[PDB]
Amino acid sequence: TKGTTSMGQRHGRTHILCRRCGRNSYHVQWERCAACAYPRASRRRYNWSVKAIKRRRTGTGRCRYLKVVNRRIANHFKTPK
Amino acid sequence: HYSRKPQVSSKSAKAKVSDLRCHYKNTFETANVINGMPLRKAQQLYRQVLAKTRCIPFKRYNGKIGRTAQAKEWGQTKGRWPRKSVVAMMSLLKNAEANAIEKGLDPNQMVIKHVQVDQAARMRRRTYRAHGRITPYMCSPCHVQLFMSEK
Amino acid sequence: VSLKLQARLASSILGCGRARVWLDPNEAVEIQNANSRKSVRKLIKDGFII
RNA sequence: AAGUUUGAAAAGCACUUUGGAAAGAGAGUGAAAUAGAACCUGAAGUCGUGACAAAGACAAUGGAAGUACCUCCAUUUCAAC
RNA sequence: GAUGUGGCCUGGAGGUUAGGACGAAGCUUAUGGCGUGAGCCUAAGAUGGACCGGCCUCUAGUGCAGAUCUUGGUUGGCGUAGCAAAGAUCUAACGGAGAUAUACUCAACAUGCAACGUUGGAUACUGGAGCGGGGAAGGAUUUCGUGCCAACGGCACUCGUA
RNA sequence: CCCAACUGCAGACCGUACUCAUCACCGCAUCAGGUCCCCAAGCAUAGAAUGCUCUGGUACAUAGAGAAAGGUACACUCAG
RNA sequence: UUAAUGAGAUUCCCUCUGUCCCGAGUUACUAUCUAGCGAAACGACAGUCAAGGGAACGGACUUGAAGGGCUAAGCGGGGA
RNA sequence: CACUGACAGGGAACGUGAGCUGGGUUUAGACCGUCGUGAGACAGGUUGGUUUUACCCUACUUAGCUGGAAAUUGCGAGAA
RNA sequence: AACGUGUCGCGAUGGAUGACUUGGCUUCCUAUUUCGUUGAAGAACGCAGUAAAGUGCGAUAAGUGGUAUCAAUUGCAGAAUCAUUC
Numbered sequence A: 001t002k003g004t005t006s007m008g009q010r011h012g013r014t015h016i017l018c019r020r021c022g023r024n025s026y027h028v029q030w031e032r033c034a035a036c037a038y039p040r041a042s043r044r045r046y047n048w049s050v051k052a053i054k055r056r057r058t059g060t061g062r063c064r065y066l067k068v069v070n071r072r073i074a075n076h077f078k079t080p081k
Numbered sequence B: 001h002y003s004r005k006p007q008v009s010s011k012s013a014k015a016k017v018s019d020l021r022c023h024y025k026n027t028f029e030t031a032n033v034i035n036g037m038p039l040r041k042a043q044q045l046y047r048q049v050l051a052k053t054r055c056i057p058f059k060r061y062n063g064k065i066g067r068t069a070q071a072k073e074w075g076q077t078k079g080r081w082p083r084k085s086v087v088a089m090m091s092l093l094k095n096a097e098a099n100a101i102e103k104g105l106d107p108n109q110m111v112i113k114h115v116q117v118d119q120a121a122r123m124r125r126r127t128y129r130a131h132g133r134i135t136p137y138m139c140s141p142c143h144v145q146l147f148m149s150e151k
Numbered sequence C: 001v002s003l004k005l006q007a008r009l010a011s012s013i014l015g016c017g018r019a020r021v022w023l024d025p026n027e028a029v030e031i032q033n034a035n036s037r038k039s040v041r042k043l044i045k046d047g048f049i050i
Numbered sequence D: 001a002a003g004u005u006u007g008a009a010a011a012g013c014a015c016u017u018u019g020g021a022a023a024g025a026g027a028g029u030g031a032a033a034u035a036g037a038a039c040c041u042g043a044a045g046u047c048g049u050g051a052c053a054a055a056g057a058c059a060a061u062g063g064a065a066g067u068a069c070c071u072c073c074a075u076u077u078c079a080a081c
Numbered sequence E: 001g002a003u004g005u006g007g008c009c010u011g012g013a014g015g016u017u018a019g020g021a022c023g024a025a026g027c028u029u030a031u032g033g034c035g036u037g038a039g040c041c042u043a044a045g046a047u048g049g050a051c052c053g054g055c056c057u058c059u060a061g062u063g064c065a066g067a068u069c070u071u072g073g074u075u076g077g078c079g080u081a082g083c084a085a086a087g088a089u090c091u092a093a094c095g096g097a098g099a100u101a102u103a104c105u106c107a108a109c110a111u112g113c114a115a116c117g118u119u120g121g122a123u124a125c126u127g128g129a130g131c132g133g134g135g136a137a138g139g140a141u142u143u144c145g146u147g148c149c150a151a152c153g154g155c156a157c158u159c160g161u162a
Numbered sequence F: 001c002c003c004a005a006c007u008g009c010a011g012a013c014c015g016u017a018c019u020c021a022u023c024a025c026c027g028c029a030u031c032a033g034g035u036c037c038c039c040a041a042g043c044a045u046a047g048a049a050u051g052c053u054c055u056g057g058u059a060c061a062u063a064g065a066g067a068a069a070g071g072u073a074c075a076c077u078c079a080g
Numbered sequence G: 001u002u003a004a005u006g007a008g009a010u011u012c013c014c015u016c017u018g019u020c021c022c023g024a025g026u027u028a029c030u031a032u033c034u035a036g037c038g039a040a041a042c043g044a045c046a047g048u049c050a051a052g053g054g055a056a057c058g059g060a061c062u063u064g065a066a067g068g069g070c071u072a073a074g075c076g077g078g079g080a
Numbered sequence H: 001c002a003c004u005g006a007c008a009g010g011g012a013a014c015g016u017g018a019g020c021u022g023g024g025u026u027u028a029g030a031c032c033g034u035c036g037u038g039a040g041a042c043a044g045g046u047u048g049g050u051u052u053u054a055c056c057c058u059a060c061u062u063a064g065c066u067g068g069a070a071a072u073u074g075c076g077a078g079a080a
Numbered sequence I: 001a002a003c004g005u006g007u008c009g010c011g012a013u014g015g016a017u018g019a020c021u022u023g024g025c026u027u028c029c030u031a032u033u034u035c036g037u038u039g040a041a042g043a044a045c046g047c048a049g050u051a052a053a054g055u056g057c058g059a060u061a062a063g064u065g066g067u068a069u070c071a072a073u074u075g076c077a078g079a080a081u082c083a084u085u086c
């Protein structure tokens, strides 16, 4: 019946890890990610979840290049004589 | 520390144990029965409780425990033989005897004058009940402190 | 002293189950010295494991 | 969910003794270990212990008047004052 | 239900006047005194260790017994209900701190019980649609050796997928 | 340059432990539930029924003592 | 209307029986005692009755009658 | 219908469901008649349809310990 | 008697209160202030003598170079010099 016994009938996976976000939201069968919409070029972004936007926005990661370019802009692209 | 101090400090020996991992209710009755006893006769009683020829009287935490004829010597009807609490209390008495011997006292003249069992901090486990319920499975350790004085 | 490891190795070397492996009740301190299949094979040859 | 808020400083309890150990008993540091490491202060509730008060069964609590006993409480008085 | 109160209390601000290492706040009370009361004040701490009181005015997230109120902790029930499907273990030796553990008296019983792991014997079960031997899915080091027993394996462990 | 029999040299990448369940997966858990495939002995017997047994595996599922009432049972019997 | 079929609804007969007259005896596992472990529900405060009034069915109130204290195993009258 | 001396009438929350049972009544499934355009309706008929919890306090039944006449005290002194 | 009750002294359990505050919230201002195919944001692996997380960094990996600055870093260890610099 539904409940405990049917819990043992659940086999396989609907989602695996996504190449773009690594969130385990990549629909194996449909071949698209539920979290970032990969392989669509643009990501998922909805204003009905501002909390979800703040989890993935700029500054929540490393900003490896943005840190460098911000310093260059703040110093007006200083170069040696 | 100890809730009471001995009359003569130099003629006394103290022993303590914290978080015993013996049932507080069982150790409460096992330790209280030897409160006014000479040390040697208290140690004899614990040996006979292990031999099941005498019992520990359960005076407070005795809700629906069995009845035995060995509780009559204590003026009660209900008693038990808590072997786990007896061996721990046997170890505590041995420590107290060692403290007395190191101080130059005679353990054969030592009389227990203070026994105090207190509930320690509990440890948490869980048990699984019907309809997917999770319910506490607490363990209740005890603190035991005592001292004995020369007679 | 536990001879679980030697019994496991002896059972594999002899190609039989645990019930058919006999370890000498005496001479247990030299059986427990055999930590390898080479040393267990010597116990079998010496008759300490049958 | 979670302040690592010990102490001014780790000076974080050498060493002796019992214990398989955890620990206890001593001894030391420190102004203070009841400041001993999730360590300032440490409430309420609940519990243990010693001492005492007694108390039938009127569930207990409560009100008003007394009394017995206690009182680490307050004030007054102590010479014809 | 309305209103009044040089009526009480709390966190901050502008003033004023004080206190504190000879001990501030907080906390404790058979500590008494004052007030009809909200409360205020003193005493003691065998409490604490650094801030804080009075008065005038200003200000506000300003007073709790209950909302099947929220969060944390505690609690009687209570050593109680129970820990009863899958038949089952016994014995000696070894190992282990886990013993044959003792004031007097006392030959041993009647005063150290109960429990562990391994090996050899004994007995039994699974009974090839197996508590057999290999794989997929799922899990991801649970595998192996040594060591170890604080927590965990709802009893236990010296054992362990700890 | 192309065939035959040799011969010489080189054969790159990832997976590989363990488990697959009355403890390793899902069911909050070492949960009497659930979960695909292969190999499958002897005797009785029509036999993959059922019962017992060699091999392999196991003695792990809290135990001891032990005739109250009343219970539960994949336990029985009962005159007329 | 209908042969065959049906874990479908109904009536009767044979057989059979503890369904009953009318209960009795036995077994395993419990309950029960012990060692270890150890909850929950529920919990204003509590808990002997009769009558009376009363929100018209009181554990508390009135007037009577009981009631020494503490306990183990049960039990289902009340605790609307 | 039958026996009998007789087969009286009633109350106790129309006594009594943590005592049972669940046939009826009164969910969801389904059939018929009547009604309704219809969804549906019918104190009309029919068939199928989870009955949970006591370990607390009293009450009751048995089963233990145990003080107390100033009903624990006063020394407060009463003899069927 | 025993359970049980009450009070006081002392303990335990339990972490409220006060003091503390490198945090939050709110308001205001100053700019040669606005990323990416010259590969961004995000995601994943790795890097220390010792290093799980976090931080920093990218096989030149808890960092290379250059300017200043002037003797450390620090749990332990290691380290030419005790330092104009290299």
Ligand SMILES: [K+]
Residues within 6 Å of the ligand: none
């Ligand atoms: K007034």
Ligand SMILES: [K+]
Residues within 6 Å of the ligand: none
């Ligand atoms: K709560």
Ligand SMILES: [K+]
Residues within 6 Å of the ligand: none
């Ligand atoms: K009908």
Ligand SMILES: [Mg+2]
Residues within 6 Å of the ligand: A009
């Ligand atoms: Mg399916």
Ligand SMILES: [Mg+2]
Residues within 6 Å of the ligand: none
């Ligand atoms: Mg199926």
Ligand SMILES: [Mg+2]
Residues within 6 Å of the ligand: A029
């Ligand atoms: Mg699909």
Ligand SMILES: [Mg+2]
Residues within 6 Å of the ligand: A028, A029, A030
């Ligand atoms: Mg596909």
Ligand SMILES: [Mg+2]
Residues within 6 Å of the ligand: B064
């Ligand atoms: Mg019982």
Ligand SMILES: [Mg+2]
Residues within 6 Å of the ligand: B064, B065, B066, B067
């Ligand atoms: Mg009992």
Ligand SMILES: [Mg+2]
Residues within 6 Å of the ligand: B127, B128, B129, B130
């Ligand atoms: Mg359960």
Ligand SMILES: [Mg+2]
Residues within 6 Å of the ligand: A004, B132, F027
């Ligand atoms: Mg479940």
Ligand SMILES: [Mg+2]
Residues within 6 Å of the ligand: none
């Ligand atoms: Mg000093």
Ligand SMILES: [Mg+2]
Residues within 6 Å of the ligand: D034
């Ligand atoms: Mg202090």
Ligand SMILES: [Mg+2]
Residues within 6 Å of the ligand: D035, D040
């Ligand atoms: Mg302090």
Ligand SMILES: [Mg+2]
Residues within 6 Å of the ligand: D042
């Ligand atoms: Mg403290």
Ligand SMILES: [Mg+2]
Residues within 6 Å of the ligand: none
């Ligand atoms: Mg308290």
